[PDB]
């Protein structure tokens, strides 16, 4: 079910010492790769430094991303006008049933999707004027179209397979959460219950509230990452003061054989 996805970003006038362009590469919700226009080199992130990886893998990455850098910084020439720009791209692929890849290639300008890459016609598309401009600049190039094709239909899925084999260790990692449930006097005759999940991987996880064994739904959920690739979650609920000890909190998660009841 997992997927290789690159998060390309360029800006037209960067705060100085900031990079004009940069990429983050992801395997599922793990960041494996990292690149930017200053350093100019694709580097492994996190536990992926220790991946049993082959020679030339990384400089293949670098080579590809440099073509991307050029393309992206080229886009702002095509747009012409003054006002600062932010060009984003989401590129990748996901494995499908029959030893089959499914590609993704969308882009956004100043925070709105506007352009895409049609893998059938081998053309960029989108119909905003901005997208027509950029689409045109790229389509008339040293076979930029072909390289995007190879990158998505060949390189991407070949990489994805390679990482699955050589990086099971990371991908299949499992860490169940530490749980805490607490009561916080809030209002007049009210109080806030907060269930919290600490340090878990993978990030799929649900929090639920019971009140004497019957569902009180969920309230506001919150979800986030820790420094170490693990995750954090919390859910909160309004509740009659003095009626607190009646509630508990239940948690579902891949790293637990069965759902956990969490007392106050």
């Amino acid at each position: 079910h997992l997927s290789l996805l690159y998060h390309l970003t360029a800006v037209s006038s960067p705060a100085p010492g900031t990079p004009a362009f940069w990429v983050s590469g992801w395997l599922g919700p793990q960041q494996y790769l990292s690149y930017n226009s200053l350093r100019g080199e694709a580097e492994p992130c996190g536990a992926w430094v220790w991946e049993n990886q082959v020679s030339w893998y990384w400089e293949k990455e670098t080579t590809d991303l440099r073509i991307k850098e050029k393309l992206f910084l080229e886009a702002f020439k095509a747009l012409g006008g003054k006002g600062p720009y932010t060009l984003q791209g989401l590129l990748g692929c996901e494995l499908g049933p029959d030893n089959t890849s499914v590609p993704t290639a969308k882009f956004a300008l100043n925070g709105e999707e506007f352009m895409n890459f049609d893998l059938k016609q081998g053309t960029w598309g989108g119909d905003w004027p901005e997208a027509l401009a950029i689409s045109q600049r790229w389509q008339q190039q040293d076979k930029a179209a072909n390289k995007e094709l190879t990158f998505l239909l060949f390189s991407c899925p070949h990489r994805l397979r390679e990482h699955l084999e050589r990086g099971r260790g990371n991908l299949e990692w499992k860490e169940p959460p530490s749980m805490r449930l607490k009561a916080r006097p809030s209002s007049p005759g009210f109080s806030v219950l907060t269930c919290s999940a600490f340090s878990f991987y993978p990030p799929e996880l649900q929090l639920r509230f019971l009140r004497n064994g019957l569902a009180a739904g969920t309230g506001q959920g919150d979800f986030g990452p820790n420094s170490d690739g693990s995750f954090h979650a919390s859910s909160s609920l309004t509740v009659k003061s003095g009626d607190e000890h009646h509630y508990c909190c239940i948690v579902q998660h891949a790293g637990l054989a069965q759902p956990l009841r969490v007392e106050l």
Partner: protein, 583 residues
Amino acid sequence: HKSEVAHRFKDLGEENFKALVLIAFAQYLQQCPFEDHVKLVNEVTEFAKTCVADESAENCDKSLHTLFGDKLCTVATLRETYGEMADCCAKQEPERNECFLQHKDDNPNLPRLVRPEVDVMCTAFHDNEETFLKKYLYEIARRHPYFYAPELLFFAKRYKAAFTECCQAADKAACLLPKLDELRDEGKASSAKQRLKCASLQKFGERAFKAWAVARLSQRFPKAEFAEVSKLVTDLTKVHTECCHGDLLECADDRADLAKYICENQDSISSKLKECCEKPLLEKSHCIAEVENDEMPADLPSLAADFVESKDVCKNYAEAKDVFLGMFLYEYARRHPDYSVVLLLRLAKTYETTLEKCCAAADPHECYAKVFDEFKPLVEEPQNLIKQNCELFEQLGEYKFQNALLVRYTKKVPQVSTPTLVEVSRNLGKVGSKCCKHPEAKRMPCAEDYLSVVLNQLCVLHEKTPVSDRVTKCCTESLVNRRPCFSALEVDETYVPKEFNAETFTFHADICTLSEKERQIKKQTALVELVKHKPKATKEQLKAVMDDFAAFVEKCCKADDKETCFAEEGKKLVAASQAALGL
């Protein structure tokens, strides 16, 4: 002859033909399953038979490239399963074949060959033999797309010989695996020597290869007259030019003829050829490629006579640069089988530079009288390097040696990726195993020959994915001066060091499943990474932080609840290491 397909088929015979064609397709289409290639080969063969029959029949006039081309574009998927290869089917001959040639070994990185169990192999061999051997050819060819086609045929005969000689034994493993393992080792070295030969030809020109060949042959055949060494060098050039451009059928033929020419004229070439020339077609050429140097003539006059004292030096240099200099390599070469070719070419380079500059001078003789002095430093430097390197290899392990090199090269070339650096070191390091065994006299040349091959491998792959400016320079500047260029390289102070964080040493408990071979590669990785964190790190600090590392690993695998340790100690090893490095 009207038909080239016809000619070759006749000359090479059917079985060789089918083999060479199968290699051809394997080398171009490295992932097309085996069965498919066999259909393609069998189609192309059967077409050929109809031209051996009637040379004027439909399509037999076409060139080999058109035919093999036409056929490779049968598989249109190419893109989905190979990539920028498909772009080539777009084009027309001759641009088309040049395309196919660039797009070999974009993917070295193909699944490894796990050997089946000795008995299952001997099953398969006894059963469908004809195939089993074809699979060998296909598997090897596709992982080494520059492999010297005609030699691969010979390797294939050796493979068969081993199974013929061993599957009747009670203990088959004891018999066979040694033979297959030597055969695999010979193979990996051969592929490499050949890749240098093709790089030389393609990227550096005919002149460059011819120079190499003259130096090399003159070492092996020191009694042969210059006139004879030339004809050989020319013949050798045609042969290699041909298998490097993918014309396997033509080059196999021409090689056969060369072996035949050599044997017919043994007396004017070498006394050490008697044994070799009494052998079957395929072992003839191998023997001759592999044989011992002839003993050098009695009382050869000083190189000074013709190349310094003679007052015709500049005249001849003007009248025939390439011939004259060839005479120089020939004369120097035959006097010095001990020296490596690489070194001799550097010497010839200096000589030429010298003449170029000196003949322009007011008094040319005066100018070049002391030219032989210039060679002293060019000789010492390699001797000194190999001498120091073999002391280091004895004084330390094969393992501990590699680590020394790994650190050395990482400091020169940190822009290159960690896995690439690990591997390159492992290979460079193998120069200890291979050469330092040999005695004093014979070390440098073994070393330089082998190093030159290893470096060219780096360069050929680096060219497709350039990442370090320094590598580009050394790989490009001079073929003959690569090794010294790299050795000369200082600590790269332009590199902006990797920084630390808590997560820098992130390991899940999967590391304790690891073998030793496996866990050593990992240590080597951590080592490379440390250097990248601080390139001016001294051996002291480095081994300190590296001991801390191994302390860490041993510790955490040996605890109840493994991943508490990693999680908890992972940041402390970092803290430790910043201190132990400065920051």
